[PDB]
Enzyme design. Structure first.
Site, PDB file in Angstrom:
ATOM      1  N   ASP A 286       0.828  -1.207   0.000  1.00 49.20           N
ATOM      2  CA  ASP A 286       0.000   0.000   0.000  1.00 49.20           C
ATOM      3  C   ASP A 286       0.861   1.257   0.000  1.00 49.20           C
ATOM      4  OD1 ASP A 286      -2.566   1.141   0.109  1.00 49.20           O
ATOM      5  OD2 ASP A 286      -2.574   1.189   2.315  1.00 49.20           O
ATOM      6  N   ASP A 287       0.569   2.151  -0.939  1.00 45.61           N
ATOM      7  CA  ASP A 287       1.091   3.516  -0.933  1.00 45.61           C
ATOM      8  C   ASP A 287       2.582   3.562  -1.256  1.00 45.61           C
ATOM      9  OD1 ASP A 287      -1.566   3.791   0.144  1.00 45.61           O
ATOM     10  OD2 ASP A 287      -0.996   5.646   1.168  1.00 45.61           O
TER      11      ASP A 287
ATOM     12  N   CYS B 143      -6.597   4.436  -2.814  1.00 49.40           N
ATOM     13  CA  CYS B 143      -6.564   3.008  -2.548  1.00 49.40           C
ATOM     14  C   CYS B 143      -7.764   2.275  -3.112  1.00 49.40           C
ATOM     15  CB  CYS B 143      -6.439   2.686  -1.071  1.00 49.40           C
ATOM     16  SG  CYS B 143      -5.225   3.662  -0.124  1.00 49.40           S
TER      17      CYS B 143
ATOM     18  N   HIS C 216      -9.636  -2.482  -0.407  1.00 50.90           N
ATOM     19  CA  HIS C 216      -9.628  -1.446   0.634  1.00 50.90           C
ATOM     20  C   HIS C 216     -10.691  -1.712   1.670  1.00 50.90           C
ATOM     21  CE1 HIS C 216      -8.869   2.548   2.321  1.00 50.90           C
ATOM     22  NE2 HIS C 216     -10.181   2.733   2.327  1.00 50.90           N
TER      23      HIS C 216
ATOM     24  N   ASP D  43      -0.512  -0.237  -5.001  1.00 48.81           N
ATOM     25  CA  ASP D  43      -1.762   0.388  -5.430  1.00 48.81           C
ATOM     26  C   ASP D  43      -1.635   1.798  -5.994  1.00 48.81           C
ATOM     27  OD1 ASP D  43      -1.426   1.524  -2.873  1.00 48.81           O
ATOM     28  OD2 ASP D  43      -3.613   1.555  -2.459  1.00 48.81           O
ATOM     29  N   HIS D  44      -0.532   2.515  -5.786  1.00 50.03           N
ATOM     30  CA  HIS D  44      -0.331   3.843  -6.345  1.00 50.03           C
ATOM     31  C   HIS D  44       0.990   4.373  -5.800  1.00 50.03           C
ATOM     32  CE1 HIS D  44      -1.502   5.275  -2.477  1.00 50.03           C
ATOM     33  NE2 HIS D  44      -2.555   4.470  -2.553  1.00 50.03           N
TER      34      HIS D  44
HETATM   35 CA   LIG Z   1      -3.013   2.940  -1.003  1.00 51.71          CA
END
Ligand SMILES: [Ca+2]
Length: 459
Positions: free
Chosen positions: A11-12, A50, A104, A288-289
């Site tokens: 994540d992130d 997300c 999410h 995710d990004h």
């Molecule tokens: Ca995320």
């Protein structure tokens, strides 16, 4: 030969990794995985937040097909029928494992997982932070703790060490079954909470501080005011720019969190090897990004900027696969929405309608000439839709009236040798040809004559 699939879904995470040329990040286990597979240097997400990114990846459909561009709407609260990764794999005889943060909203497809370990809440382990939260509870406040923590604790004192433990145990349990397993590591999403030994890999004073500069002539809503970070205790909410010390603490926490997750990747890979599963398991490392840790003086994600849309992606085919490539890079323009149709082809399944395409060809032949564009969106409330395209060198973004398709502003950013650009070239007479070419690519994905964008976010 149908292989198993193990996906590390982080994540992130932008590509702040040694193997991606980071001069700061200490990431030995992820780097080793890259030496064993194909590293994609031009991989991009379909929205830099997300929930839309993850449901898009898990359905193989773009956010603008689903009409979900914010964070408060589970996929299955609107779209109960679109076929997802766990649904398709479970129907085709695979065990389906979700650990940590995958969707999410953990309720999405909960019954499509044969083995489910919920994502867990944040943990603050320092008594001072525990006391802050206690003083909140005995004050009626629901408020966040600080934006980071460096407790001198075992790895399983935070959720990602626990996720690694669940993955190791489940690999042992499932060793003789066909499986697809998502290990959703939550750091480096805020708060940057990671054990002391990972903080101790870095000196906060060594980090270069990004310039506190917004791109010249940017669209007015190109960047947010990073409300996500402002919600954490100790973050001033009334200033354009954070100070050098706090900026460094945040950069430090993001890096410590990455090295913590790197160590957890290593634990899961060690189990995969010890169990004899590497011979028949493809491993994917994805995010995710992207993210900002002070770039443009800004923080978090929530934009169509290159730095927020570009992600790491590493694919390592199972060791029994005769055509496997190891230690090579690909500059093919690929998208996270391609992962589901790739898995469909890899595992010999009949898949659903998709907005992506299989990249299995490029995994096996990384220099294959590939796609002309990768695209994303970002909604600014119901009335404004940003839609963006890159060809691998330039990024072009239109901020449109989401109903009429009229342009409210346009941006053209050069990204030949940097993820950052400080000058919007849209309308500049020296760049008319680049702008026209990029606009044509954008408009093929985002026509102006097919009505409004779909809007299906709910309260
Ligand atoms: Ca995320």
């Amino acid at each position: 030969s149908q292989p198993n699939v193990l996906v590390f879904y982080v994540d992130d995470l932008r590509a702040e990794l040694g193997c991606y040329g980071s001069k700061t990040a200490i990431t030995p286990n992820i780097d080793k995985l890259a030496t064993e597979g194909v590293q994609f240097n031009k991989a991009y997400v379909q929205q830099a937040i997300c929930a839309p990114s993850r449901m898009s990846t898990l359905t193989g459909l773009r956010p603008e097909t689903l009409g979900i561009y914010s964070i408060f709407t589970p996929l299955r609260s609107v779209h109960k029928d679109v076929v997802s990764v766990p649904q398709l794999f479970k129907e085709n005889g695979y065990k389906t494992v979700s650990i940590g943060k995958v969707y999410h909203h953990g309720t999405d497809d909960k019954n499509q997982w044969t083995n489910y370990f919920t994502k867990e809440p944040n943990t603050y382990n320092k008594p001072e932070n525990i006391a802050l939260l206690e003083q909140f509870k005995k004050e009626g406040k629901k408020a966040n703790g600080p934006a980071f923590e460096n407790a001198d604790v075992a790895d399983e004192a935070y959720k990602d060490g626990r996720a690694a433990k669940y993955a190791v145990e489940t690999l042992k349990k499932l060793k003789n079954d066909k499986f697809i397993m998502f290990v959703g590591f939550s750091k480096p999403h805020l708060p940057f909470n990671a054990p002391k030994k990972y903080w101790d890999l870095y000196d906060k004073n060594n980090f270069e501080i990004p310039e506190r500069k917004k791109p010249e002539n940017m669209y007015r809503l190109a960047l947010t005011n990073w409300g996500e970070l402002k919600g954490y205790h100790g973050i001033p909410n009334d200033v354009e720019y954070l100070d050098d010390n706090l900026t460094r603490d945040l950069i430090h926490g993001y890096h410590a969190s990455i090295s913590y997750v790197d160590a957890q990747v290593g634990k899961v890979m060690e189990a995969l090897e010890a169990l004899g599963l590497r011979k028949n398991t493809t491993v994917i490392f994805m995010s995710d990004h992207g993210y900002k840790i002070g770039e443009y003086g800004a923080w978090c994600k929530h934009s169509n900027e290159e730095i927020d849309v570009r992600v790491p992606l590493i694919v390592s085919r199972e060791t029994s696969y005769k055509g496997r490539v190891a230690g090579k890079t690909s500059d093919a323009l690929v998208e996270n929405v391609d992962i589901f149709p790739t898995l469909v082809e890899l595992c010999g399944l009949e898949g659903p309608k998709t907005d992506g395409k299989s990249i299995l060809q490029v995994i096996d032949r990384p220099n294959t000439p590939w796609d002309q564009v990768a695209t994303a969106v970002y909604a600014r409330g119901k009335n404004i839709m940003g839609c963006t395209a890159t060809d691998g060198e330039w990024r072009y973004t239109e901020w449109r009236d989401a109903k009429t398709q009229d342009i409210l502003g346009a941006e053209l950013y050069e990204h030949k040798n940097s993820l950052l650009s400080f000058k919007n070239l849209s309308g500049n007479t020296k760049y008319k040809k680049e702008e026209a070419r990029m606009k044509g690519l954008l408009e093929t994905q985002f026509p102006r004559n097919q009505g409004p964008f779909l809007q299906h976010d709910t309260p």
